[PDB]
């Protein structure tokens, strides 16, 4: 995997993604080390691996090792799609865990369907990104990926929201708070695809890479601390032990 | 991923897989929304993602984006094997939860071993499909894949069947009714590989693709609706609630 | 996937890995059949699939169908990295199952992070192996992979060890027993990477493939029977039933 040449402006935006995800992961690891309940531990570990994998994929892209040449000649950062397949289910799992508790006590096949529809969304998106410009198959997969996105929206706004009301009041508030912010940020992703050089090409590759970088920092770092502070607040309102799970394990032995 | 040329008769068989898997997945999604028990919901979304993933892989193949050329020169539809790795464990998951209930509360290692033996089968079958024609590497991996196939057969007819009767008489009948149909349909897959153009070459790639298409429609759409109506009759027999899972969550969430 | 020829001395070491992983997997399947408790059955089939997948990857490498030509010109056995991504989490699953029991009823995200950090380690190690020799990118991913290794060592020596003490004295004794032997053997893998032909190049591709074979044989076959013997001894001290789980299912 010899490093590939990148435009200076594009590589600069990728290094902003590296430094952003690295710092956010370090702070998010603190929420892991200080988790007090299984719900707080699951949410913390999920968010941390979102940032940690995102740091790796931006390091791969910045080092010129996360892109290849499509058949039409464009440069597609496939590493971004590869890790999106793993980070975006962890984000959605956080929503489903908020709505159904940790460990998941009910409606597990709707959680698996959430992850499944999301993984399909990314994978069919990669195919649309690798399809040649101006081709019908490029937008057939775009509409296929958008249909998976619509089903993720439906599960978040329909079944999973119905179960949030069943779980509890504070779980319903946190879920609605986190599901709304996530849904607004994620909506801009197909907009960048449609207008970036992975689609209609209204703006070039550097702008496309920059917007994806800012969206990734928003959906992972900014939203992650937005969500992990709501988890911590819910765990405070729920009256959690003033003890980490590790400290509770040390005293139980 | 620019579309690669495909023989017209082969492309025609791929589209009948697209139309069949697309209509089957839409109908199966109704079984998901109508689910009333955890067992009914687990079985429903499993079959739905079986049909849904099969739709996309036949779409990819029909669009000329689901195959590559092996080093020996043949055209291999690798997309089929790629999604087979995910749709065939979901089918067997349905058998596992029919024998052990949903959620699976015991014998999880035998379910993971079932899924694992199945993934090894498809993955090693891909290597045999990409190995050269008339080589020994092809039939070693064909032999390895057949070994994992026998492991699947043993787990279905052995420990899982022994566990089905422990769950109950209704779960035993459903399991034995669906496992027999599934096992008869799945046996024809290695026969097609053996005689198709990714094996000995009794028939060409068009006939091979056609047989795989029909076998996929049978094992996924035909068997899927055969199976999922069995799990609905089981819930009806056991007195299932008059409310779906969503409607039950709406009652317990409304005020 | 047409086979690419290998050095006969290298292919010889690969075929001894096929023979070793096959022989261990057949015996380990006998432990699967004899499983008496859900804990004993979880460890058995986990260790079995470790040997089985290792048999297939050495078969793929021995047949000349599991290597790659990196951009810099070297030959990398990517099949080994591909299956490492699956077998190494199963090994740590055994330790995690030893510490928390089967099924895992608590601290599930610490097992997922254990698996997650181990996967990142093998994947970033593969990227390090494919990166050109004598380049900064290779050793950037080597350090990144080494950091994921230290996370694995931290979780094993940290929260999992504390949780093994909570599960019971027999599980804590078995956990420390298998965790120390696993940790010592795994430490030798980055040593072979650093000094082998996918690193500094102290020795060529033949010695690197031979050491990985010996290391895989030791960490999977030798350790696997060392671990599964402690698993059966643990359930033996627990007075485990003389019935297998399948025999219990037939009677019930
Ligand atoms: C951290 C990464 C995140 C939150 C990624 C989000 C990606 C999406 C919501 C996907 C968007 C796409 C479509 C719905 C259509 C095709 C193009 C994609 C993949 C950008
Ligand atoms: C929907 C797809 C299904 C049910 C796939 C079934 C595939 C098999 C049962 C596998 C067959 C193979 C062998 C047992 C040996 C090697 C060739 C294969 C992969 C066709
Ligand atoms: C059966 C296979 C086993 C136990 C593999 C273990 C592999 C490791 C502990 C990984 C070692 C690596 C590093 C820590 C840094 C980069 C090079 C690696 C991948 C060999
Ligand atoms: C270049 C040297 C620095 C290394 C770069 C980053 C290395 C990646 C390290 C892995 C972090 C994994 C932490 C997982 C612990 C989870 C805690 C838990 O689950 O309770
Ligand atoms: C420290 C945590 C690291 C997390 C995992 C790292 C994620 C990136 C991993 C490697 C992605 C490589 C993608 C390259 C695909 C082929 C394109 C090419 O290089 O030619
Ligand atoms: C290449 C396409 C990849 C798609 C990945 C799909 C991920 C799995 C899809 C959904 C599985 C849903 C099955 C429900 C599991 C219920 C668990 C149970 O109770 O048994
Ligand atoms: C050219 C445009 C083609 C349009 C194709 C439409 C794509 C539909 C995508 C699949 C949605 C599947 C997800 C359904 C939710 C699962 C239900 C559940 O888990 O409970
Ligand atoms: C946007 C959500 C609905 C999904 C619809 C899928 C495709 C239509 C959306 C954008 C495509 C833009 C117009 C391009 C059509 C083909 C013209 C071309 O080949 O360049
Ligand atoms: C042109 C591409 C876009 C076309 C619109 C596609 C619409 C598909 C949207 C998803 C439907 C999801 C319904 C799933 C029902 C789940 C049942 C449940 O478990 O509650
Ligand atoms: C949410 C998006 C808001 C609007 C953002 C618009 C961005 C426009 C930026 C400049 C357009 C041209 C981009 C220059 C990149 C050239 C690189 C290339 O073409 O390969
Ligand atoms: C609430 C969600 C917020 C999402 C933030 C990301 C959306 C807006 C992103 C920035 C728009 C402008 C992009 C920068 C263009 C200049 C890049 C360049 O061409 O050099
Ligand atoms: C580091 C770059 C950040 C880019 C913008 C981040 C996008 C916004 C992310 C979420 C922050 C929350 C925004 C406002 C919360 C409103 C609360 C509510 O919805 O009730
Ligand atoms: C089971 C439902 C089946 C649905 C009907 C499927 C119809 C398939 C028909 C042929 C597909 C097109 C074949 C490609 C030929 C293109 C050559 C040309 O147009 O010149
Ligand atoms: C959203 C509804 C449809 C679901 C689609 C998701 C299922 C799988 C999608 C397509 C898989 C494509 C894999 C083919 C890549 C082969 C590589 C190649 O030929 O170059
Ligand atoms: C007909 C040729 C046979 C070749 C034999 C060699 C191939 C072996 C293939 C995989 C064996 C899979 C074993 C899986 C059973 C697991 C046991 C369990 O989970 O309880
Ligand atoms: C205990 C093992 C039971 C299984 C027995 C079947 C194993 C078959 C072994 C492989 C035969 C491969 C033949 C390759 C011939 C190579 C000769 C050459 O060209 O150099
Ligand atoms: C080669 C096989 C092609 C398969 C495609 C045709 C689809 C199969 C049609 C329906 C199968 C229904 C199976 C069980 C019927 C249940 C109806 C009922 O309960 O009354
Ligand atoms: C051509 C591929 C699509 C095939 C569609 C097959 C349609 C099968 C529809 C369901 C018929 C069964 C009615 C629902 C279950 C009733 C049986 C029962 O509850 O006991
Ligand atoms: C160096 C070439 C070796 C050739 C193969 C050697 C085979 C014998 C090796 C040891 C296997 C021991 C298996 C233990 C049998 C357990 C039987 C029991 O008590 O249930
Ligand atoms: C019983 C067997 C179980 C193990 C199955 C897995 C065996 C190994 C799987 C595939 C290894 C493929 C290695 C990559 C091939 C590179 C050749 C190339 O395409 O250039
Ligand atoms: C090349 C990939 C081959 C397939 C990889 C997947 C194989 C996994 C096999 C199953 C081992 C799992 C053992 C069951 C442990 C669960 C019970 C527990 O966690 O306590
Ligand atoms: C290509 C990058 C590969 C990344 C490896 C896989 C990453 C897995 C990371 C950890 C999984 C998230 C842990 C969350 C625990 C949830 C369990 C629960 O429901 O309580
Ligand atoms: C120069 C220093 C290099 C350091 C490399 C990276 C070190 C990583 C070490 C392990 C990090 C583990 C973090 C886990 C947090 C606590 C987990 C818990 O017990 O809940
Ligand atoms: Cl990512
Ligand atoms: Cl499929
Ligand atoms: Cl391995």
Automatic annotation (TrEMBL), chain A:
Query: Does the keyword field hold Metal-binding?
Result: no
Supply the alphabetized keyword list. Answer: Chromophore, Membrane, Photoreceptor protein, Receptor, Retinal protein, Sensory transduction, Transmembrane, Transmembrane helix
SMART domains, per this entry?
A: Bac_rhodopsin
Principal localisation: membrane
The membrane-topology field of this record reads: Multi-pass membrane protein
Biological process (GO) annotations held by this record are:
phototransduction
The membrane-spanning stretches of this chain are 12-32, 44-61, 81-100, 112-133, 139-162, 174-195
Q: Name one GO cellular component term.
A: membrane
InterPro entries from the UniProt entry? Arc/bac/fun_rhodopsins, Rhodopsin_retinal_BS
Record-given protein name: Rhodopsin
Question: Which species?
Answer: Salinarimonas soli
């Amino acid at each position: 995997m010899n490093p590939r040449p990148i435009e200076p402006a594009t590589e600069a935006w990728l290094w902003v993604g590296v430094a952003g995800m690295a710092l956010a992961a370090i702070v998010m690891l603190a929420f892991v080390k200080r988790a007090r309940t299984p719900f707080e531990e699951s949410q913390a570990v999920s968010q941390f691996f979102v940032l940690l994998i995102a740091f790796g994929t931006y390091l791969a892209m910045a080092l010129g090792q996360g892109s290849l040449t499509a058949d039409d000649g464009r440069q597609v950062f496939v590493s971004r799609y590869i890790t999106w397949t793993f980070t975006t289910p962890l984000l959605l799992l956080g929503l489903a865990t908020t709505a159904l508790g940790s460990p998941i006590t009910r409606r597990k096949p709707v959680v698996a369907g959430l992850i499944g529809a999301d993984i399909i969304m990314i994978l069919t998106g990669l195919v649309a990104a690798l399809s040649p410009s101006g081709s019908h198959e490029k937008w057939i997969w775009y509409g296929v990926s958008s249909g998976a996105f619509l089903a993720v929206y439906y599960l978040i706004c329909g079944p999973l929201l119905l179960e949030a009301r069943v779980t509890g009041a504070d779980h319903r508030r946190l879920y609605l708070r986190n599901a709304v912010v996530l849904s607004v940020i994620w909506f801009l992703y197909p907009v960048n695809f449609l207008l970036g050089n992975e689609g209609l090409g209204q703006w070039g590759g550097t702008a496309t890479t920059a917007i994806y970088t800012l969206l990734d920092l928003a959906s992972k770092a900014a939203y992650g601390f937005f969500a992990i502070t709501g988890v911590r607040a819910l765990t405070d309102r729920a009256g959690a032990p003033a003890l980490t799970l590790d400290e509770a394990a040390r005293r139980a032995g």
